Design a protein around this nucleic acid. Sequence first.
RNA 1: UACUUAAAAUUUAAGGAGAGGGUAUCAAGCACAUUAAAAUAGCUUAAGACACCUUGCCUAGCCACACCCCCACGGGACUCAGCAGUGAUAAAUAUUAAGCAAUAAACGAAAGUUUGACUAAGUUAUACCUCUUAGGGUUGGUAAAUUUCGUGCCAGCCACCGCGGUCAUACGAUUAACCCAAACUAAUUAUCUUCGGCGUAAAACGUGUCAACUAUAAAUAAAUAAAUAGAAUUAAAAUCCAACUUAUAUGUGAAAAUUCAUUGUUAGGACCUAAACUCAAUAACGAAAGUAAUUCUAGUCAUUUAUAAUACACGACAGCUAAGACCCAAACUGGGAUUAGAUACCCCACUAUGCUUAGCCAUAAACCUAAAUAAUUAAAUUUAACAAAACUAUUUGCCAGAGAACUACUAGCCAUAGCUUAAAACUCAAAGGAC
Lengths: 170, 108, 70, 136
Amino acid sequence: PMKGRFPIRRTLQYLGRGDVVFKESVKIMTVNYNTYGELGEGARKFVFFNIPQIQYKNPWVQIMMFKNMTPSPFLRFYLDSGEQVLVDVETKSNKEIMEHIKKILGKKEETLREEELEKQQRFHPGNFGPRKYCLRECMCEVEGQVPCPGLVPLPKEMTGKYKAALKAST
Amino acid sequence: ATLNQMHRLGPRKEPPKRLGPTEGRPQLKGVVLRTFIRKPKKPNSANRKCCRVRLSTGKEAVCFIPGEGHTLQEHHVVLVEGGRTQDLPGVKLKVVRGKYDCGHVQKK
Amino acid sequence: VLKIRRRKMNHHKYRKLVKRTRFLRRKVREGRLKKKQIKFEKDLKRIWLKAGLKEAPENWQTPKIYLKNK
Amino acid sequence: AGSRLETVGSVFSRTRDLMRAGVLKEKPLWYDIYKAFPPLREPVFRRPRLRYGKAKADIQDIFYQEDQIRAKFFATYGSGQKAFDLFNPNFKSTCQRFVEKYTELQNLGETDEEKLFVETGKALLAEGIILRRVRE
RNA sequence: UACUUAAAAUUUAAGGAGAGGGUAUCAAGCACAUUAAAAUAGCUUAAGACACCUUGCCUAGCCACACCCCCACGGGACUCAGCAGUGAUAAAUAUUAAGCAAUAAACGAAAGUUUGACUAAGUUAUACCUCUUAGGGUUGGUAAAUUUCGUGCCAGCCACCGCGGUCAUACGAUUAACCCAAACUAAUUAUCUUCGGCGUAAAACGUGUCAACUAUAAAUAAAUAAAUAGAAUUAAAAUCCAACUUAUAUGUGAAAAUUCAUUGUUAGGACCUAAACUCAAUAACGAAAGUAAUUCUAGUCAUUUAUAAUACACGACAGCUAAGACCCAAACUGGGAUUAGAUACCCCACUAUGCUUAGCCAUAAACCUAAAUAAUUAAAUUUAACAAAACUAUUUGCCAGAGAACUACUAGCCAUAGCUUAAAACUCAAAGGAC
Ligand code: FES
Ligand SMILES: [K+]
Ligand SMILES: [K+]
Ligand SMILES: [K+]
Ligand SMILES: [K+]
Ligand SMILES: [Mg+2]
Ligand SMILES: [Mg+2]
Ligand SMILES: [Mg+2]
Ligand SMILES: [Mg+2]
Ligand SMILES: [Mg+2]
Ligand SMILES: [Mg+2]
Ligand SMILES: [Mg+2]
Ligand SMILES: [Mg+2]
Ligand SMILES: [Mg+2]
Ligand SMILES: [Mg+2]
Ligand SMILES: [Mg+2]
Ligand SMILES: [Mg+2]
Ligand SMILES: [Mg+2]
Ligand SMILES: [Mg+2]
Ligand SMILES: [Mg+2]
Ligand SMILES: [Mg+2]
Ligand SMILES: [Mg+2]
Ligand SMILES: [Mg+2]
Ligand SMILES: [Mg+2]
Ligand SMILES: [Mg+2]
């Protein structure tokens, strides 16, 4: 049995389910929540369930959380321009909080798809090389091309050993 | 241990693998110094043929000579290998029959 | 059962061994403390010499902390 | 060949399973009857366990409203000198007559318990019942 | 390479989101900081500084080195860590070979030239592939497979368990069989790595409080019979003194020694040493250790809760230091007996010590052999067994086969034959727990 409560939170599949990918402006996200109360239940659940997913997709954003410092829970984002975006998450479900921050400061699906394609621009299927980078190491692997001498012996006339012998004979 | 304690400690600390009589080498070459008999621990009862040797490393070790009959003498050269003699305590080396001065057991 | 008896028997043989060599151990200790003091003094001399001082700070005398001061 | 495992399933479930396997070729005569008129609960084995901590049973103490009146009568007059007959299904004891009159007065609208207790004693005295206010 | 100014490749310097070997017996480093009138006293560090040890890693490749002195003005022990080759060393063993025809590099405007880069060969069962000869090991169990004979705890065999003292499927030869096969077997090294545990088996490590984190969520407590400290007090039994007084008293299984300066009585006197019957068949108080004769004084109490050392404060008994006390008990010591011996057990005398006043030491089977805290009693939970029904969550501490080892070394300590901290070599195939 995996230790802790809700051990599914400690699986790569769960961490990858997060959909909030912040815009490049977002630099810090402070989370102010209360450990006791009734109107802050969604905030507590957001710290428990959602903060790991947000950090996983936004490794360079500083997430710092403060407890029981104010009467109500809120989120404050610090942007690179110097703007500060305050969000009030009282009486809001954890799912509601995620959708709100996704709308205001989350990259759209179109933008993310473009980045993925651009990342793979330099991979070409025709390129030959090691398995880590390429599909085929050598043209001998291709069908119809001359096979590797190691697997299949070459004709004698295609061998330097044989060609050298004829030149001596000449 | 708790997840916080497992994090602060990391993976288990692993004692290093100390070497044996051959010092992590397949074989060693040594010069015989003496040939003597060792008595196996009870319940075993025999007169096991062993020899002391000076290995190339510079240390001196006791090596069991296997087989029925050996012609080894002082100043001979032998190739020792690993493998402990279970009944003989402290004998952690064995001589290879058929290499250098030591020869294959003489089937008679 | 035999584990406390062995601690007892092992502990019994140590107390006997300490008694036989009690006087030797005393001279070992007095010499280990003297080396412990010289190591302390030298370590203090290294500090001021490295800092660039040619003599120890004025009015400073390394305290003798391992001697029979108490 | 059978399933003498009386801690797994029930006599019916084990008989159903044995026939599916192919070991029991003829239905028992009680089988079809159980299928058509089963018991309310399935007779499956369960190990009685004890209760621990703050677990408690759920049994209602049976206390009717007459018991408040009956308790006072036994404390003030004890049990009626006439002996209870618990074989007569319609027996009326001296205490039960006290409670029947006490109720009648309370229907009229008297709100004081003290008034209803002394008035009922007077009414039964007129009836001729011998009520002894035995403090002993 | 384009423009006479812009796209690259390639580097260099200063940096920092994060990640990055081992030892904590390396626990402190000793200038490691800020300000910018030049003052302030700061900087790193158990979230691992500093010190030491080890290792090429980041793998289309990268980094460092180029005889040695980290460097290389200088100096020295004065150059193959280019290809081939040699000496020495090592278990470890490729040609002192051919060609610049291909590709790459250098040069030239160029035809071209050069290259131990490289290409084509040579060498080697180290691997793979294609074929053709068959050899190697094994045959008690794990683990596929033995016939006869010899040997007789000898000779030998085994990875572990083991085998051999006269019917050995285990050693040697032989027979057959089994496995693999141009290999086969031996040795060496490598590939597998923490979500498990802590009453009885390794492990909650004497007690409590304060931090920072990680969790948690409630606003109470106390008012308690023997907590603790001080002062005062005294009932029973002793001790001492005195009167009277037996001739003995004392002591054991039995005796001896001891004693008559004894013994018994005292509603005689003194003492105020030491310990607190019954209550107590009670289960209170305190953090633990511990605490119960009486009275009085002081006194325990609210932090949401769990979670602490390198700090602070405590910590039975024994023991040390100094001055007192001393009824009784009692290590040691002496005497008596006992026994083959008594260095003990039993008897008598007596000392350290138990007490007080000041410190010190910091040890227990310091144990309820149960960390604390909040839950739940059903999850078809005897989830081993025995203890004390089980089990979830949270936080910290701790454990990783046994012995070596309540040890060696290290550091700290009023401790000096001491305590706390705590290994390795080496040995074994078990040790251990409950029934
Ligand atoms: S790997 Fe392609 S020719 Fe050999
Ligand atoms: K034997
Ligand atoms: K160098
Ligand atoms: K060329
Ligand atoms: K054979
Ligand atoms: Mg050490
Ligand atoms: Mg050289
Ligand atoms: Mg150099
Ligand atoms: Mg060379
Ligand atoms: Mg050179
Ligand atoms: Mg080789
Ligand atoms: Mg050119
Ligand atoms: Mg035989
Ligand atoms: Mg065998
Ligand atoms: Mg055989
Ligand atoms: Mg234990
Ligand atoms: Mg202890
Ligand atoms: Mg007193
Ligand atoms: Mg008071
Ligand atoms: Mg005394
Ligand atoms: Mg106990
Ligand atoms: Mg001890
Ligand atoms: Mg010690
Ligand atoms: Mg020590
Ligand atoms: Mg070890």
